[PDB]
Write a protein that binds this ligand. Sequence first.
Ligand SMILES: OC[C@H]1O[C@@H](O)[C@H](O)[C@@H](O)[C@@H]1O
Length: 445
Amino acid sequence: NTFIFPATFMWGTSTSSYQIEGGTDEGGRTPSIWDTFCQIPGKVIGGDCGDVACDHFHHFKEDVQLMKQLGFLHYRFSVAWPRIMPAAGIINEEGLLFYEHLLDEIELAGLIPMLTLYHWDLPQWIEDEGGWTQRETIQHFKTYASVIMDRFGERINWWNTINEPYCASILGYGTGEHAPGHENWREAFTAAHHILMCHGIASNLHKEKGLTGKIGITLNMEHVDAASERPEDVAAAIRRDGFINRWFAEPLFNGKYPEDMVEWYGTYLNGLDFVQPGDMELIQQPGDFLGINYYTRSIIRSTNDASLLQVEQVHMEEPVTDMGWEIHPESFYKLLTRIEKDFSKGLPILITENGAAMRDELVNGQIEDTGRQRYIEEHLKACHRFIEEGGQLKGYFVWSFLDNFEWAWGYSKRFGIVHINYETQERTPKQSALWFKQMMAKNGF
Ligand SMILES: OC[C@H]1O[C@@H](O)[C@H](O)[C@@H](O)[C@@H]1O
């Protein structure tokens, strides 16, 4: 009953720039959409903002070393756009130097990095020009992605373009749940198109420069189950799947939007006008790997309400994390199998994020997070079963090396395998982290 993963399997840890850096108004960084969003009453639990956060901006060397000490050979992080392009075409050298030093530390500890170009922290000045709803933003992104690729790239083995296009578009401009906080479906679908194009843009910049680092986009995906055998529930569930999964994966691999969903969004697509000749061709560029983020599954039933999809999620109280998210590792296996069947069909799959937020408690200077553990272990078994059966899973990154600003949840949720004392900013590895260290040592468990 042992689970040993390939010899070449990629074991890593992942973070986000806004969630851990802090130093919001330092080194020339200008405000990002989240800096603004977090100040709007009700948008973030407790009114928390990414100000200071884990202060990684100052503790980066101790963190990267902490990673090494923990036996990690890979580290995925994102670059804060606001640190690089603080204003319309200026190129903040100070921001660039920060990441350069971060990289000096990574290479020094013997780690292999993965740079994520966009992790939701769009510069605010860009949002003032219309944000992701303006084609013009794609050019600003072209400027940004180019600067990073030129300044680096010679030492970036792995390029991660966009992290979860779905969240930035649907939640950012559609539901109002993520920055900038709009509630307009037309704007959301337009933004999703634009963000997807940027993956293709970065992909062209990657080829035009001749970089050798593997590149690819990361899509969050979730397995969808119907709440019952009722026809309308089954339909309901097809709709949710197209909403989060197929709307982004289809264009990426097949060069098109789900016909059913396109028909369902009707007037909101305004005739797909935002789609210009060449666009789809630009977006349909899988690359060398498909990054995937997974946390849970959804159980859907239909409704006849005013919402966009007229769907209702069945909230399982069963094993769940501190965020109310159900723990169903089996769905992870099914999702991965499904992914390879369509879209993926062979391409290297990489789980750029997976993990859980459990209520932590410090006892005797240690964190006995058995839960976050029953969680990572079981999902890894699901990954192991996916392999062993032919699946092309090439790696796994545990989400959140450190506890951090969990977006709308603020600091109330802890996803880290390393505990952050926010009063003193001291790092303290949790039991799950130690376990992960032994596991990576034996390359299995
Ligand atoms: O659950 C919160 C987590 O969700 C993942 O989908 C996001 O990529 C992470 O940035 C975030 O911390």
